[PDB]
Amino acid sequence: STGSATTTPIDSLDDAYITPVQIGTPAQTLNLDFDTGSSDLWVFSSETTASEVDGQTIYTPSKSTTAKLLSGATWSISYGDGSSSSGDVYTDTVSVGGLTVTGQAVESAKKVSSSFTEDSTIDGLLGLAFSTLNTVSPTQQKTFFDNAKASLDSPVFTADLGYHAPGTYNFGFIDTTAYTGSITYTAVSTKQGFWEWTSTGYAVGSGTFKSTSIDGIADTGTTLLYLPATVVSAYWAQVSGAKSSSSVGGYVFPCSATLPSFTFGVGSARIVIPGDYIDFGPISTGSSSCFGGIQSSAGIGINIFGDVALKAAFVVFNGATTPTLGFASK
Numbered sequence: 001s002t003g004s005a006t007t008t009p010i011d012s013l014d015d016a017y018i019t020p021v022q023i024g025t026p027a028q029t030l031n032l033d034f035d036t037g038s039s040d041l042w043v044f045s046s047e048t049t050a051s052e053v054d055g056q057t058i059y060t061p062s063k064s065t066t067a068k069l070l071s072g073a074t075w076s077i078s079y080g081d082g083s084s085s086s087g088d089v090y091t092d093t094v095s096v097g098g099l100t101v102t103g104q105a106v107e108s109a110k111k112v113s114s115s116f117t118e119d120s121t122i123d124g125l126l127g128l129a130f131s132t133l134n135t136v137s138p139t140q141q142k143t144f145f146d147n148a149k150a151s152l153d154s155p156v157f158t159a160d161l162g163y164h165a166p167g168t169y170n171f172g173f174i175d176t177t178a179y180t181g182s183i184t185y186t187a188v189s190t191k192q193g194f195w196e197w198t199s200t201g202y203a204v205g206s207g208t209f210k211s212t213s214i215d216g217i218a219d220t221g222t223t224l225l226y227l228p229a230t231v232v233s234a235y236w237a238q239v240s241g242a243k244s245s246s247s248v249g250g251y252v253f254p255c256s257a258t259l260p261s262f263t264f265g266v267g268s269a270r271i272v273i274p275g276d277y278i279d280f281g282p283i284s285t286g287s288s289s290c291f292g293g294i295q296s297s298a299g300i301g302i303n304i305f306g307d308v309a310l311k312a313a314f315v316v317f318n319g320a321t322t323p324t325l326g327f328a329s330k
Contacts, residue, residue: 001151002172003099010121013281022095024064030123035221039133039143043124045108052112055120067092075107075135083115099171101148105141133193155319161311179314179328184269188323197325204235205260222306226297248283251292266327273312
């Protein structure tokens, strides 16, 4: 079995990507944030307190002939940004881009945090981390990917995120027409339940590649690229009039500027993020300041290769019993 679904940025800034998901019978189509940095499938629902739903489309279990209440199971999750939600749990049919899974644990939100209520475009999250992170209790539930694994042509999914443009989540196969060169595979640690890997270093612009280990997670639901302070200071040093701003909370630079590329290594391979990717956009509309697309991980406590990194790459999540991460230039 395979699936293939278009994923689209929710705004002109590429803050996040949404992908339509089909839940229930007959099918209820919601727009979910595919999040390789968590492992809960959660949605706005019939059950969600009314004054907390805000333009979002909801999943009504009672209109699905194939939904079933998972007796005594509840969940509660929070994200690095401080947002949260909680509720109880249905099993149901879930289809992504052709690929269907029966008895997928569909977590129904009874309450959502104010952040979610303001985000009109996001109808919930589909988590693609390891199942060890699932919040359901007393027994943890499998992700979409875990459940699909047996029927997939290959235990893998690939993320092809676009730079101000839709792209592609693929399940069960690697599309050779989508990248250039060859995929470079690197080892994953599952010890924290993340897609966690060790980058072999970095270069800024046209200068020298420093081999230094960067431990980091590949996280499709994190907008920016967060790296050790001293790496980040190295980058923005090449942008004159770049400075760190307390007020706006990170490095800011003149929209005027041509930003240098950033290169990060994967084994012996090099992936290069074009300067234009790191120009996130103006801090307010009309401003001559833009917010920087690479920022310090120091306050997060883990390095995150989020959307700014990943969209420069064709990325293969390899879900074999020993999982690997593949990067290719595209």
